DNA sequence: TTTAACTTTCGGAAATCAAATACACTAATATTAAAACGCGGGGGACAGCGCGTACGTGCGTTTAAGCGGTGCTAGAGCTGTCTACGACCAATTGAGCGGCCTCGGCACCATGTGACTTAT
């Protein structure tokens, strides 16, 4: 059953209490964001613990956001989200747009 | 062995008491700018639909993610020690606007001497 797996696969990461992103994926990727926005000579070390606030502070707005931008989706009458629906979504939250 | 609560005080705060404005509202008033009744309207937003479509839906072979050792070192956090730097006091100013004065210049009465005159 493609909806049934897919609903209760919703459920179980909607319940599920713990982050979900790819880790050494995400670390990177802050490491290298520090190592762009640092220069030349000042360099900066990241421990465990501030990747970790990090990676939570992301997830909570993302999955926030996904909910409203899912829900400018389910308000267009349809249920793809896409550029122009979300952009707006975030962009009616205000910040960063 | 180090983070508290006894205390032992005290001198600015936070009450009080008071009267000095002064402002809010509770309110007459004719006007009069906007309200709100009242019928079409365009216009549009939704019913219904074909078929194109686009993101899932479904398999194969990859790829990275995740461990799992292997350092090693860059800072963490801590400096034990020397000031500097700023928090206080005050003096060390000052300028601005009232205060006295004090300049000189008027109007007015005093004082002496040169005529002259006269009775010495």
Redo the contacts with the bound molecule.
């Keep these: 059953t493609?909806?049934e797996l897919?609903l209760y696969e919703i459920r179980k990461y909607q319940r599920s209490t713990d982050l979900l992103i790819?880790?050494?994926?995400f670390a990177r990727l802050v490491k290298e964001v520090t190592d762009e926005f640092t220069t030349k000579d000042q360099?900066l070390?990241w421990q465990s613990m501030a990747i970790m606030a990090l990676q939570e502070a992301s997830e909570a707005y993302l999955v926030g956001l996904l909910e409203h931008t899912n829900l400018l989706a389910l308000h267009a009458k349809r249920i793809?989200i896409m550029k122009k629906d979300m952009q707006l979504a975030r962009r009616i939250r205000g910040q960063f747009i």
């Design positions: 493609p909806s897919a790819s880790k050494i994926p360099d070390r793809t």
